[PDB]
Amino acid sequence: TNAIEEFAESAPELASRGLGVTTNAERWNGRHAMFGIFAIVMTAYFKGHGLIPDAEKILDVNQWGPLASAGQGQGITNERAIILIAHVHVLVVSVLAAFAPFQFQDTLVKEKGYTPEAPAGIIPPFKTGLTPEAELINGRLAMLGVISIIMASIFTGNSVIDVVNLGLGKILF
Amino acid sequence: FEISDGVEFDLNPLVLAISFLGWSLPGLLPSNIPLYGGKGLTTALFAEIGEHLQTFPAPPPIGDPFWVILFIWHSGLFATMIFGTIGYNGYGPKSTTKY
Amino acid sequence: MTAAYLPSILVPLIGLIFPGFVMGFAFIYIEQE
Amino acid sequence: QFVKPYNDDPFVGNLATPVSTSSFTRSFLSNLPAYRSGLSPLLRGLEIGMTHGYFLVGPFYKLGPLRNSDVALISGLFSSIGLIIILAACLAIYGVVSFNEDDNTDSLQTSRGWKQFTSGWLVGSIGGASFAYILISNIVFLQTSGLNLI
Amino acid sequence: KSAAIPFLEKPPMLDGSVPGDVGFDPLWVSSMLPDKGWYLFLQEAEIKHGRVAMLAAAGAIVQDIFTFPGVTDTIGNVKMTSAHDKFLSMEGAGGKVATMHQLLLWLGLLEVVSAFATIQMFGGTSSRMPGEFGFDPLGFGKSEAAMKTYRLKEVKNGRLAMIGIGGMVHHYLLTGKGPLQFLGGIPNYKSCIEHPASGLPYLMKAVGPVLPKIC
Amino acid sequence: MISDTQIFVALILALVSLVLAIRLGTALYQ
Amino acid sequence: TLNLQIPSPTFEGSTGGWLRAAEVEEKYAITWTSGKEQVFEMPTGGAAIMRKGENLLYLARKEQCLALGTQLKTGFKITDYKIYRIFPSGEVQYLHPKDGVFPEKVNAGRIGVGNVSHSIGKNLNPSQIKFTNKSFN
Amino acid sequence: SHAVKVYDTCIGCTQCVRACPCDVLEMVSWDGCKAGQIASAPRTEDCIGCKRCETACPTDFLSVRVYLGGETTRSMGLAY
Amino acid sequence: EQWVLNPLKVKPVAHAIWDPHFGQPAVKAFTKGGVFYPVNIATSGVYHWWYTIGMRTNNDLYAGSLFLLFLSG
Ligand code: CLA
Ligand code: CLA
Ligand code: CLA
Ligand SMILES: CC1=C(C#C/C(C)=C/C=C/C(C)=C/C=C/C=C(C)/C=C/C=C(\C)C#CC2=C(C)C[C@@H](O)CC2(C)C)C(C)(C)C[C@H](O)C1
Ligand SMILES: CC1=C(C#C/C(C)=C/C=C/C(C)=C/C=C/C=C(C)/C=C/C=C(\C)C#CC2=C(C)C[C@@H](O)CC2(C)C)C(C)(C)C[C@H](O)C1
Ligand SMILES: CC1=C(C#C/C(C)=C/C=C/C(C)=C/C=C/C=C(C)/C=C/C=C(C)/C=C/C2=C(C)CCCC2(C)C)C(C)(C)C[C@H](O)C1
Ligand SMILES: CC1=C(C#C/C(C)=C/C=C/C(C)=C/C=C/C=C(C)/C=C/C=C(C)/C=C/C2=C(C)CCCC2(C)C)C(C)(C)C[C@H](O)C1
Ligand SMILES: CC1=CCCC(C)(C)[C@H]1/C=C/C(C)=C/C=C/C(C)=C/C=C/C=C(C)/C=C/C=C(C)/C=C/C1=C(C)CCCC1(C)C
Ligand SMILES: CC1=CCCC(C)(C)[C@H]1/C=C/C(C)=C/C=C/C(C)=C/C=C/C=C(C)/C=C/C=C(C)/C=C/C1=C(C)CCCC1(C)C
């Protein structure tokens, strides 16, 4: 609350529109982090089961232009390109939702006179169901899980996919 | 039809017809020069249109008489169109300005 | 994920995204009452 | 005779000329989406974006870096999408900067009206680019500009 | 409110007067455009899709039943979308038949006229209702109550046909079988029949590499 | 020879310096 | 006061006239009486015919209005030209012949604004007026 | 707006007032010069900064000085 | 590390080039450092400077960069 108000004072432009450190930003980032944990699980499954075609094939620079060449004389693999385009799909959905939101949906950028949602605090009420409390709880948990997964991958030396698999118990692959 | 804010304009297509005939009937005057063949300007244009319609997608090659005939015929036609509209609207039956 | 990917990951960012966002935000700031 | 003062006002910085105030000109301008009557700012944006994203795919498709490749059309569509996003961003920043939050009832010169216009323009532009992509990918005459008939 | 979905708010545009309106519009598509004619345009789109789908489903079934004299001799034994592809393969510049092109020509005249009609309806200038082309030779729907019952029946059967024809097309793409065959064979993937390429080959890219290809 | 972990430590220090630069920019803008 | 019913000098139109800024911020006007129908030069460009009697003209800038007034005074012998400024609210104000007599000749009632009680050499230095509110005067 | 100032050196020639394309300078009464008149700058908000007043000044160092300050529509002479 | 062995023969490279506008001819033309990717050859003399200072490995340069980041902070 104090931090929220102080930020509203420091950066009136972002806070007035709902950007920055706000409850709306927390909710949106929790949404994206949950979707991202799902995406990591799904890519783990696909890579483990070999569902990605020509995963280790290096894209041709002659066909796909200089963009197909990586930083240090390396080539982007078909798997990386496929996953990137999969992300491009949801990114275009994102741009369309942000500029032209559904009438019922929550908007990324809030109006000038919008009423900020009440800061939940330590934990929202445990309202079990498709509730805005459950959404925030699971979004916070997913964001923390993303950070923990990256840190475990860097520390233990395993891949992010390997760490997700290990944690899930090797059910994925 | 208003040519401007409140100025009306007849836009009679019979002026177009008369100017077209005024330029095209003289164009029938034949010439034995290679460009025209033996025929006149209008007839040569018609012949070229048919000849290059037979070969539709392919354009008349550079150096074909078609381009020169087209340019000359349309230059004269546009000149006659301008003069005919001038005559019909300024020297015509309902003009106001003494030109 | 190796460091060799970092140029291809970053140069488009630093050269098209950072300038675009900076220009938009600075535009909003300079023309603002 | 044909050139006169604008709106019968001799001292306004304009002249009434055939190009500026003819019947055809007035009809065309008043029937374009930016001026037609009854359209919402959203529908204006939809029509305009549809019309613009269509023509955008061609220049990119036929003259872009990957034009002699097998991915020329997809590359073209992608580059059109990028330009459309950039222009939508331009529209959004222009709206937030120029129009203050007073409500003039969606007249396209309001914050809400311009937001609707830019949203519609984005949607219509992406849709038109996709439609052009489909038509080009499926019709040979468009991929060859008619050089299939030769 | 939505009767269809008892736990979701009815969209404002769905008053319930429109035939077939049970309050089902979870994405609030009816409210996407503030213009008055938007909902009417959506209704006309639904009617048109339902009609085309009903005809397409009936055509798939009847083509399975029997074929017109000489079509077998012309296009072989191709079925469903492959017949469209075959006719178009023979409809080249140096081609004899113009089946699909003739169909497109006449339906396109009808469709440009219908485009003007729907423009007028959208603008509010015309009093035409969505899907009303004045086609009623037998006068089934002359009575307003009869017109309403028949409109509901038409929209319902159109939705069912819209689902069914898509099912039929995808079944044919998978198994090379028409509707009546696919109905007959249940372990269809055992008796799958050969089928020419769709004409949109890229859409089956993931069928084998990413997706299972039980055949 | 320079490992990804090393590049990541460098990036983390860069991020800390960016945060401090934003703080200094705010304090100077006042 | 200004009467908005005075006819105008039958100008044929130009692209040098006022623009949207005239409708949004400020629009100047000039009124003058002419003994006959002469041809004068618009400050925006082109020729215009002034009427026999009162003539009202709209411009975008006070400098344009005053240039037209100077033309009338020197070329012709019209010196009853009055200049006004109009805001979108309808707040027409009176500017030239401010006190009814042109500024070039002294008139009783004016108060000196911006007059200094020394020569320019007596101005203070910026070092002397630095970090202070003093004025270089 | 530009800051226009007049000094004791004024001789009342009035040429500064007559040279101004706007109406920023006017003659007022004075006792420090033979003419009995001094220039004054009441409508300084209309000043454009042309310095025509400065040009039309006969005193060794100018009695009228224009110090160009903040710019506005009128100062910039923007008809748009 | 390969410049501190034959500093009079090896050209010192400043940084790698990643430009999506380069053609294959340009990528090849800029792979002169024996590094297998396009590069810029330094003209600042930092190589000679650091070699004289006592820098021999890339880890030395990396530690210096870490310290200078810490000092900027
Ligand atoms: C320094 C940064 C930078 C970067 C990273 C790039 C990158 C690119 N430029 Mg270059 N460009 C730059 C600066 C840069 N440019 C500058 C300063 C100029 C002005 C002289 C140009 C002028 C220029 C031209 C004239 C062209 C390029 C093109 C290209 C492309 C390389 C060739 C190719 O095959 O791609 C092409 C293949 C593709 C599949 C393109 C996909 C691009 C996606 C859609 C980008 C995503 C945009 C994003 C969503 C917008 C966010 C906006 C936000 C910041 C507000 C590539 C996207 C070529 C091109 O095709 O561009 C479209 C091209 O024709 N550039
Ligand atoms: C100020 C020094 C400096 C300069 C001029 C450059 C220049 C470059 N770096 Mg960067 N870089 C720097 C420091 C610097 N770097 C440091 C300290 C690190 C370690 C964290 C990196 C790590 C790094 C990587 C991993 C990569 C680059 C890359 C690049 C290239 C493209 C830009 C980019 O992607 O930046 C991205 C930079 C970062 C994500 C972090 C570093 C940002 C620095 C600290 C900003 C400093 C700003 C400066 C002090 C003040 C600005 C002044 C203002 C007026 C604008 C370019 C040659 C990319 C490339 O393609 O290389 C060939 C690339 O892959 N750099
Ligand atoms: C419903 C399913 C379906 C599907 C998936 C396809 C798929 C296909 N059809 Mg189509 N087709 C269908 C039904 C379908 N068709 C039916 C029912 C018919 C009979 C009417 C046809 C008749 C048909 C023909 C005749 C041809 C195709 C072709 C094609 C291919 C390219 C289509 C394309 O790019 O369109 C993109 C274009 C459009 C969707 C329409 C463009 C409309 C323009 C922009 C408006 C112009 C207005 C104009 C002024 C109208 C005046 C009226 C005029 C008719 C006189 C593709 C495989 C072409 C091909 O080569 O296939 C191998 C082809 O030549 N189809
Ligand atoms: C994953 C993924 C994706 C993704 C994603 C996204 C959007 C991921 C977003 C991740 C985010 C936003 C992570 C934020 C983490 C914040 C943390 C850990 C804060 C910790 C604070 C602490 C410990 C504290 C504290 C404190 C204590 C102790 C007590 C307090 O009194 C004081 C104090 C505040 C100091 C995408 C969508 C790209 C798809 C992709 O395919 C995969
Ligand atoms: C308007 C009008 C008139 C008229 C008229 C006309 C001509 C009216 C024509 C109406 C028609 C043709 C209606 C057709 C409906 C078809 C449906 C609902 C199909 C559903 C298929 C399904 C569910 C399926 C499926 C399946 C799938 C998925 C896969 C398959 O393997 C199996 C299976 C088959 C089960 C008349 C003449 C009266 C005059 C009047 O004055 C004006
Ligand atoms: C299914 C589905 C979707 C979905 C979805 C959703 C709703 C996905 C939600 C995903 C969520 C909520 C993921 C949470 C992950 C949490 C982790 C990894 C926590 C780690 C915690 C740690 C390590 C804590 C450590 C801590 C412990 C133990 C003790 C204390 C200290 C410490 C050591 C720090 C979509 C949106 C993608 C759409 C799709 O069509 C359908
Ligand atoms: C001719 C031709 C071709 C063609 C073609 C054609 C004609 C293709 C036609 C394709 C069609 C009609 C596809 C339909 C798909 C329908 C779906 C997925 C419905 C889902 C409904 C759901 C989930 C409903 C859910 C329902 C809802 C909403 C609410 C509650 C109830 C519940 C049951 C849950 C090609 C492509 C082969 C190319 C060739 O060159 C030429
Ligand atoms: C001035 C002049 C002089 C000489 C004669 C000439 C004719 C050249 C004339 C000039 C003519 C000119 C400039 C013509 C240009 C025409 C243009 C740019 C036409 C553009 C047409 C655009 C079209 C169809 C767009 C179709 C888009 C569609 C369906 C989009 C649909 C969709 C949307 C909108 C959103 C969701 C996705 C979905 C459903 C796909
Ligand atoms: C690498 C890694 C490991 C595991 C965990 C983790 C998630 C952190 C992961 C990801 C790390 C990431 C994404 C790090 C990102 C690095 C970034 C954004 C680096 C950028 C650094 C930028 C710097 C210095 C900029 C310095 C700018 C300065 C002085 C500007 C000076 C100034 C100017 C120009 C104007 C006046 C004010 C001021 C401040 C004097």
Rounded-to-integer distance, Cα I43 and Cα I38, Å: 16
The residue of G19, G62, G99 whose CB has the most chain H CBs within 10 angstroms, and thus the best one to mutate to test that interface, is G62
Distance CA H66, CA H47 (A): 9
User: Looking only at Cα atoms, what is the longest distance across chain H?
Assistant: 44
Q: Is H8 on the interface with G (CB under 8 A)?
A: yes
H-helix or E-strand spanning residue B42 = helix B41-54
Beta strand segments in chain E, E: none
Distance between CA E125 and CA E114 in Å, rounded? 15
Q: How far apart are the first and last CA of chain H?
A: 18
Strands H3-6 and G53-59: unpaired
Under 8 Å between Cβ of D52 and D132:
no
Distance from residue I36's CA to the centre of ligand 2 (Å): 21
CB-ligand 4 contact for A142 (6 Å cutoff): no
Instruction: Please tell me which of the candidates G19, G95, G120 has its beta carbon nearest to residue H62.
Output: G120
The secondary structure of D88-121 as a DSSP string is HHHHHHHHHHHS-S---SS-SSSHHHHHHHHHHH
Pocket residues for ligand 5 (CB within 6 Å)?
E 54-55, 57-58, 135-138, 140, 157, 160-161, 164, 167-168, 171, 179, 182-183
Indicate the burial class of H66 (C-beta count within 10 angstroms; 0-12, 13-18, 19 or more): buried
Residue B68 has which token pair?
């020169």
* C-alpha B23 chain-centroid distance: 6
| Experiment type | cryo-EM
Residue F8 C-alpha, separation from nearest chain A C-alpha, in angstroms: 9
Q: Which of these, I46, I47, I37, I44, lies nearest to I10 by C-alpha position?
A: I47
User: Minimum-distance ligand to the CA of D135?
Assistant: 3
Minimal-distance CA residue to ligand 9 atom 23: F18
- Answer whether A99 touches E (CB < 8 Å): no
Instruction: Return the C-alpha torsion angle H22, H28, H30, H33, nearest 10.
Output: 40
Structure tokens at A44: 């783990």
Question: Is chain E adjacent to chain H, meaning 3+ CB pairs within 8 angstroms?
Answer: no
- State the distance from the centre of ligand 6 to the C-alpha of A80, rounded, in angstroms: 24
Resolution (A): 2.7
Task: From D51, D80, D84, D133, give the residue whose CB has the most ligand 8 atoms within 8 Å, as the site to mutate.
Answer: D51
Q: What are phi and psi of G86, to 5 degrees?
A: -120, 130
At residue G123, what are phi and psi to the nearest 5 degrees? -60, 145
For residue F11 and ligand 9, the question of a CB distance below 6 A is answered with yes
Residue entry with tokens 């249940």: E186
Contact exists between C and H (3 or more beta carbon pairs < 8 Å):
no
Residue A102 Cα to ligand 2 middle (Å): 39
Q: Cα separation of E61 and E161, whole Å? A: 12
D106 touches D112 (CB < 8 A): yes
User: Which subunits sit against G, judged by 3+ Cβ pairs under 8 A?
Assistant: D, H
Q: Does A10 touch chain F (CB under 8 A)?
A: yes
Our answer on whether the CB atom of A29 is closer than 6 Å to any ligand 4 atom is yes
A contact chains, 3+ CB pairs < 8 A: C, D, E, F, I
D139 alpha carbon – ligand 6 mean position (Å)? 47
The two structure tokens encoding residue G24: 């949004």
Q: How far is the CA of E210 from the centre of ligand 7 (A)?
A: 21
List the one residue out of E68, E86, E61 whose CA is nearest residue E76.
E86
List of residues 6+ apart from G64 with CB closer than 8 A? G28, G43, G44, H79
Distances (CA, A) of D141 to A126, D75, D149, E97, E137: 62, 19, 8, 20, 42
CB-CB under 8 Å, D122 with A99: yes
The candidate with the shortest Cα–Cα distance to D14, out of C14, G19, G21, is: G19
Domain ranges of chain D: 4-144
Residue F11's nearest CA partner among I65, H70, E8 is I65
H47 is in an annotated binding site: yes
Question: Is D1 in CB contact (< 8 Å) with chain B?
Answer: yes
Contacting residues of G for D11, CB less than 8 Å apart:
8, 11, 14, 17-18, 44, 57-59
Q: Which residues pair with G48 in a beta bridge?
A: G40
Contacts of F26 in chain A (CB under 8 A): 10
F8: chain A residues, CB-CB within 8 Å? 154
Cα(D29) to centroid of ligand 8, in Å?
17
D61 annotated as belonging to a binding site for a ligand: no
Nearest to C6 among A67, A71, A80 (CB): A71
CB contact under 8 A, D3 and B4: yes
**Spatial separation of the C-alpha atoms in residues G123 and H2, rounded to whole Å:** 18
Closest CA of chain A from E7, distance in Å: 12
User: What's the gap in Å between the CA of I46 and the closest CA on chain A?
Assistant: 22
Alpha-carbon distance of D77 to D85, in angstroms, equals 12
Distance CA(G56)–CA(G42), nearest Å, equals: 13
Contact F7 C1 (CB under 8 A): no
How many Cβ atoms from other residues are within 10 Å of residue A30's Cβ? 20
E strands, I1-73, are 13-16, 39-41
Ligand 5 atom 41 nearest Cα: E136
- A112 touching D, CB under 8 A? yes
Q: What is the DSSP letter of E11?
A: P
CA dihedral angle for residue G133, residue G134, residue H2, residue H3, rounded to 10 degrees: 150
Residue of E8, D13, E78, E54 whose CA lies nearest to G61:
D13
Relative orientation angle of helices B13-27 and B41-54, to the nearest 10 degrees: 100
Among the listed residues A153, A39, A32, the one whose alpha carbon sits nearest the alpha carbon of residue A94: A32
Question: Identity (one letter) of the amino acid at G82?
Answer: K
Query: Are I73 and F9 in contact (CB < 8 Å)?
Result: no
Report d(CA E61, CA E179) in Å as an integer: 6
**Using the beta-carbon criterion (under 8 Å), do D11 and G57 form an inter-chain contact?**
yes
Give CA separation, I20 vs A76, A78, H3, in Å: 14, 19, 55
Distance of alpha carbon G13 from the chain centroid:
22
From the list D3, D4, D11, the residue facing G17 with the nearest CB is: D11
* Closest residue in chain I to residue A64, using alpha carbons only: I20
G104 with H18: Cβ contact below 8 A: yes
Q: Residue E106 CA: which ligand 3 atom is closest?
A: 54
Q: Does G21 touch chain D (CB under 8 A)?
A: no
Q: Could you say which DSSP state residue I6 is in?
A: S
Is D131 near ligand 8, meaning CB less than 6 Å away? yes
Give the number of the atom of ligand 6 that is nearest the alpha carbon of residue A167.
18
Q: Is the dihedral of CA G3, G5, G10, G16 positive or negative?
A: positive
Q: How many A from CA of D55 to the centre of ligand 1?
A: 19
For residue I72, the tally of other CB atoms under 10 A from its CB is 13
B4, B56, B57 ranked by CB distance to D21: nearest: B4
User: How far is the centre of ligand 2, averaged over its atoms, from the C-alpha of F4 (Å)?
Assistant: 16
Report the distance separating Cα A163 and Cα B5, nearest Å: 76
Looking up tokens 């006449």 gives E106
Beta bridge partners of D5: D15
Q: Which of the other chains make 3 or more beta carbon contacts under 8 angstroms with chain F?
A: A, C, I
Phi, psi at G84, each rounded to 5°? -130, 160
Beta partners for residue B8, in sequence order = B2
Which of D85, D81, D108, D77 has the alpha carbon at shortest distance from D95?
D108
Interface contact D122-A92, CB threshold 8 A = no
Contact E209, E186 (CB under 8 A): no
Top CATH class, D4-144: mainly alpha
Alpha carbon of residue E209 to chain centroid: 30
| CB I48, CB I23: distance < 8 Å | no
C10 lines ligand 2 (CB under 6 A): yes
The answer to whether H33 is annotated as binding is: no
Q: What whole-number distance in Å separates Cα of residue B62 and Cα of residue B85?
A: 34
> C-alpha distances in angstroms, D121 versus D47, D52, D118, G8?
7, 9, 5, 45
Q: Is E190 in the pocket of ligand 3 (CB under 6 A)?
A: no
How many residues appear in chain G? 137
Give E174→chain A minimum CA distance, Å: 20
Q: Which residue has the tokens 């492959």?
A: E82
